[PDB]
A and B are shown apart, each in its own frame.
Chain A
Amino acid sequence: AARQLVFLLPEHLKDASSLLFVKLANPHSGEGATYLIDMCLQQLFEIKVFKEKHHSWFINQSVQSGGLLHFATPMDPLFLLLHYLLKAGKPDCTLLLRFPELEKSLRHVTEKYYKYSSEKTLKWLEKKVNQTVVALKANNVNEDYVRYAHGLISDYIPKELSDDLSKFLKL
């Protein structure tokens, strides 16, 4: 038979009150990855995969090998919009940034004229570590969290190797 995908999609995507899977550059490390973009509500989501050795699915009256579980999780375009400037230091990319509330979000890391800032980004990235420290306390992921919470944002940015000085010493 034809390959069946097992997705976990946010509850809202269902209602109309339009959906495109666009291959975009991996901001941390990699030439690319899958990203699902909401065109009606105008939002971004990343696609992660659960792959574990020796699993398969019984989907209705069929078997699907692998046992993959795909997730569409809300993405902060700030991580994805970082690579357009990141290379300066001082394919589907187009539709990706062009959305409402873009310029107001852009004034966090960078700034007609747009200019990248290393100072604001370090302040923003540090706030995220604490923001994800709150979640790690609520979700209870098994102080010591300082090193762990910093690490989670590293899988979303290559400037975390430049933020290894931001590890222990904040910046």
Chain B
Amino acid sequence: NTGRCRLSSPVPAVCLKEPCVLGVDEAGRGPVLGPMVYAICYCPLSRLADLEALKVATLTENERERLFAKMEEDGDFVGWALDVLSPNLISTSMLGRVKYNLNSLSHDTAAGLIQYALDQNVNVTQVFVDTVGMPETYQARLQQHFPGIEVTVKAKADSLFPVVSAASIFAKVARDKAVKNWQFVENLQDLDSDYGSGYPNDPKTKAWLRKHVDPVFGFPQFVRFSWSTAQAILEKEAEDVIWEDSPHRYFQERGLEAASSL
């Protein structure tokens, strides 16, 4: 696993011969807490009618789970793959000396999951990717990378194409099984897991982070250190840390000087 973690269903045989259509979507782009999940759902152009039903446009946690199992049942034709990204990998990526923002971390993650499908010999002929605002530049980078297929990027994709609507579901469902798994362990180890929504705009989430600042180390793994809310709390609550980027010659070249101090 290491930083990220990929979970995947075996490729249904139909998908290796029949022309396929693929849907890319995510969950967890925005919280301070927990992972960011990416999901691809693919299915034959012929079997699109079967998915037109399991398509919304909202759908509660219970209904999401139900629709997730309904798709998981019909694994004879619907294929899926997930890449669950840790708050730590998100922290480390964005806090490198080399700038590497969420959007880049996000989309590179989309590229890999679409690439996985290709490497699995899924007869992908058309990809649809959901986005947040202005789809253009995203289509440009994505189409340029995948020149053998049509790549469509629309902000309303989770509402236009059932395959994106399905990818939205696995991603949301995986995002909730991952936070429940952390909560379960938290509670086992008698730790406080009452954070709230997970978003930095939540008074209860803000409160939780404030109650959880080790002066030396800051927060536990779960916290996306790279978030401004996260950083801002560490500036007020933890010890100040200065990083690398915030003859008389020999000793100067090694960093050596005499001890007057002692």
Contact = CB atoms under 8 A, between A and B. Distances in A.
A154 B244 CA distance: 32
B260 A48 contact: no
A54 B246 CA distance: 8
A46 B258 contact: yes
A99 interface: no
Instruction: Name B's interface SS.
Output: loop
B257 interface: yes
A34 B258 contact: yes
A33 B260 contact: yes
A47 B258 contact: yes
Contacts of B247: 148, 151-152, 154-155
A26 B259 CA distance: 10
Contacts of B260: 30, 32-34
B242 to A, nearest CB: 5
Indicate the size class of the contact surface on chain B: 10 to 19
Given A49-B256, A50-B255, A21 B262 contact: yes
A151 B259 contact: no
B57 interface: no
A63 interface: yes
Contacts of B258: 26, 30, 33-34, 46-49
A52 interface: yes
B13 interface: no
Contact of A48 (B239, B243, B251): B251
Q: Which 8 A-B pairs have the closest CB atoms?
A: A151-B247, A34-B259, A47-B259, A34-B262, A33-B258, A52-B255, A48-B256, A54-B242
Interface of B: 216, 239, 242-244, 247-251, 254-262
22 contacts: A32-B260, A33-B260, A34-B258, A34-B259, A34-B260, A46-B258, A47-B258, A48-B257, A48-B258, A49-B257, A49-B258, A49-B261, A50-B254, A51-B255, A52-B255, A70-B259, A71-B256, A141-B250, A148-B247, A151-B249, A152-B250, A155-B247
